[PDB]
């Protein structure tokens, strides 16, 4: 699909507006809209100049360069709008901006191709989300508060409702996965799936999740790295907008509630060259030597990866023992962060990395995982024996500060081939350290419950 | 478009009413409606008499003269109405009223043509605005209050709403520019753009701005001075009416909230003669010597300009250090009030003056900027080197300072009869009244600071 | 009164606590309490160490040195407490801290003695205050508010009260000075006077003032500079605490309400040497040449004085024309900021400076006035003829102007080492912080004026 | 320590009698100053102050060695002097966090008060908070000082003049780990027992785990939309 096809769409669908979209360092989607008559052949060659100083980690003019292959009609805007995803390029050389996550992911794929290890990398993430009816939160000198409310919440079993309380609710850790009316999100999940199919995703399934307050997941088909990162951005956009249109509120926080299961994003990975899966072989669980080296690299650089795959303090609320935290690989053990799914055909052999959570920036997380795996392959890092059976077993970072320190001290595997720059890594670390400092310095209601009388 | 075309439009659109519009000194549109059958050939030659004594700064029987080229159908009135912009002429000589902003802008353009420096002046303003759900304000002997409420306001993260609180809101200084549902004004901005295009504006983009409580901007294509002033008036009208129709409330105040970004109107300028941009050259950032002289004039008369480009006390609550307050020109520095945008095509070479605000009267602000630039060109005022510190001049720190500088620096505005001493005095008094009100009313922050001392 | 007398009082009144009090740069009393048994002979020679880094303008271990002559029993604390006023001394040399207002006032008196012009300076200040039933104020990103409520407020003529609304209230600018029940503060003022006399003040009169929302003043007898500054501190303390005990709320703000009279502190001054008033003579209004020179100095340095006598932004909301803003001296004219009261006895001859306000730090304001007068005497500055118009100098129109003039006019304060450059800079910065807050926070009147424009 | 217990009891009960409620939490409010417990220390033998001398700020070699021991075992001490997670919301840069001694510097965690009489010479350790157990905190400070004296741990030059300067523990987990690894100076002389230290560490780790695992409203403010 090209600029000619985009210009044809503009007339086929009577498009009034075009929404240029991109992703910031934190992973949030930013969009700027231009009227359709401003889109011409020169638009796809020169882009649009915008001031990126107001973006989070880009504080120093840059060019928004549309990627026509990402053109897709917006199903939510009242006026006919076309969504084109864009890369941020330097104004003069029209080269990828060092801090652009999409550019970083594209450079990671290019480095993968250059090294000769493989031709394509396949990513399948499995994000989950929470649907709520009401969320209220605030902080000030006088205190702080968070209050989550959902009709499916078990704590509402005593709530008085206009029209009566209907009782049927999923119990705590009991929403996987009863039939309605206990499951009250069937229609919303189906409509999300249909909208995703319209927007270009291939949906594999959708269902309710373990937690009680409307935890749901829509499982979509795998895809190449940058393509699947764009697909994840579309996925989050669709979930948020559908929840808003149904009177709900979607959230991808790793751990919104205590005592109930959190939300994770298991990332399936595979490598292919000339249409041949390189992770298929005669080694453990049908893996290959390349697959074992990839696992070893991911294990070695797991703490550095955590700074990008679990970039929020809330993520380490779910990355606690008792959500796997052990850095080992096993096809059966459920305490291993890395698992090898049992698959019939070798063409579908893959490794599932389970610690990542959906709050991660898709581009940066996937790039970090791929770069760690490639470092493992290049340096032939053997991961050891499978954890089929203990303080010798390495674990994921226990805090965002630890993850950021490890990323600071372990930058080489990300700087290999120019995928990541020291400036980009420093900007990311500072941007996350600001949030970490705020959370560290704000008191805690549990701290009052524990220490007020002491 | 002429009178014959207006009379044709009346039958084509089954127009029932014609709304004659003009701008007062403060910059607010004033409209008087007449039935369509009152519009004939004699109407476009003799105008309509109206009593302007009750207008703000026009206190002493003037003529409303329609400008058919401005004819446009109103998209909001229930009855089919046609909007015609009008100049205010003296009843006898039918010459422009000295205190009419549109007449002043037209005279500024005519002076530009007469001096021979250029044929046309191009202005790209970039106003921003705030959208709110509720605004309450008042004052009395017992006290004074202002309370802003918007669903996008971060402070509503704790508010209880009927139907539940959806927690997707912009953070403070974090509304630039995430996708919905964090951005809740996509449909409103799209409707504004479509209506603006209906009313004759060329839209370039629209987006959410840095501030949290629904700050938005719709960018429109540049145009000649008087045309772009009319376009800014139409822009403000469309924004206000669309926000009203969506249940919102638009404001062009420079600084409605403290601790969040204010609203400004960056003014891009360029001069063209015989179709060639005169601001394009081999000097700094591709500028020409005339461009440098224009920058120098704007810098020299910046404080006087502030009285017209930042005519509200609230304006100087965004023109505070920690900022676009330094009177210097640079292509890279964010601290310079004058920027040279990086444009590949020399035909697009221009200077961006950053200090103005959308509360300014468009006609008067543009005329002041043009006249300062022309004074710089005529007197060959060199702006010095680009700012790539205490000696650097700054914009006026208060409306009183701006008005005093305007009082003491009238010549560059009186060149060519564009501004008249009477008009300048009327403007200064009209603004000094508001300044006195704000200066004499006590402040809640003053209570917070001094109640116990 | 000395240390022996203080130790005797401790047993005489069965004192349980001793409250050491001092004044910060802004003029607020700070108190630290110690048990009575911690007070001994060594206490009055070595003082008490305290950490002043957290005080307003004292940021860098200083000594609180009690002044036994100021010992007085607190009339409000439940436990028998003795109030001793203390100076702030450097720990090593035991010399007055450069930024201690009381030390500055003492040094001003010592300089007056050293120059030989006079032996003593007499100050009669006349502060006024407001009594309210409820005050609510706040500011945030969403807005800001202030709401004053008092039963005497004219706006309460329509309010519904439990038990009924009694309609006897002062009108706006009509509280000077009808009998009760229109005046509802007779008992409060009488209690204030009695407590003040208990605390060592000599009261002359008390009455309701012009404003409606419970403006009152209690007049006290003049006294020497430092003594009268301590008396003013005791006055403010007594007013605040008595109002609190009566369910009211006292404020010494210059201008709490718009459209009603503000609160001022007229400062009467005179100089005496060997028991003869030096301000008595055969010149205008019975003044002497030294009195005229004092007036001339005060006029010359009036703007610099304003930074200390009117140190709040709110102050310049009462120093507005339509007013005591003209820097001239006359015995009859109400427009002159300096008056010569008509007194039969030459011993009572004095000059009344009208612009100061009760929000001023008493020590710093009195020291500034005295130093300006002494500069006028030394340099023989003639104030011209009595003002019995645009050329007449006026007081500073803003706190920024006052602070700039203080920055540029420090010499008359640095004469004799009274004020130190570091102290002046600290004061200027401390006031500029508040000025910046008030300058950057938007105004409800600004919304009323500019929301639609 | 008994006096501190009586102090806390009296404060709580008087506040209750007046209708108020008192708390010794290190940091109940964000954006405003927290509550601390500066501990002044001095050793005396035969009525003679052993911290008086001709060294810096009138200190003695024993005083400097005591300071050095406190600095060396500061992180282990923190597990007892700052035994709550809230404590480390007070011990944040922007400060009392730098482990150095000075008579003037406000950033020094150890301060030497300027006192005329040598008999009153002492060292003030500023990081401890009032949530600490007085007995255990004072015992830890004394044992660290005695280890410094016994091993002649010189504290270096005073901080009268930066990543080389050691800092107090940044979290209760760090403090507990350092206490676990630095038991010897507390176990000297049988004062602390391994069982007692383990019980303390487990008891505090329970609270640390609860606070670590419960989500935060600021976390919602920051991450709900991401
Ligand atoms: Mn799942
Ligand atoms: Mn903008
Ligand atoms: Mn009076």
Residue numbers in the entry:
A (entry chain F): 1 to 60, 65 to 326, 329 to 395, 405 to 469
B (entry chain E), C (entry chain I): 1 to 60, 65 to 326, 329 to 394, 405 to 469
D (entry chain H): 233 to 326, 329 to 395, 405 to 469
Sentences from the paper on this structure:
AMPylation (adenylylation) is an evolutionarily conserved PTM characterized by the covalent addition of adenosine monophosphate (AMP) to the hydroxyl side chains of amino acids in protein substrates. We developed a strategy to enrich for AMPylated proteins using the histidine triad nucleotide-binding protein, hinT. Although its physiological substrates are still unknown, in vitro characterization of hinT revealed high-affinity purine nucleotide binding and phosphoramidase activity. To investigate the structural mechanisms of AMPylated protein binding to hinTHN, we used AMPylated GlnA (GlnA-AMP) as a model substrate.
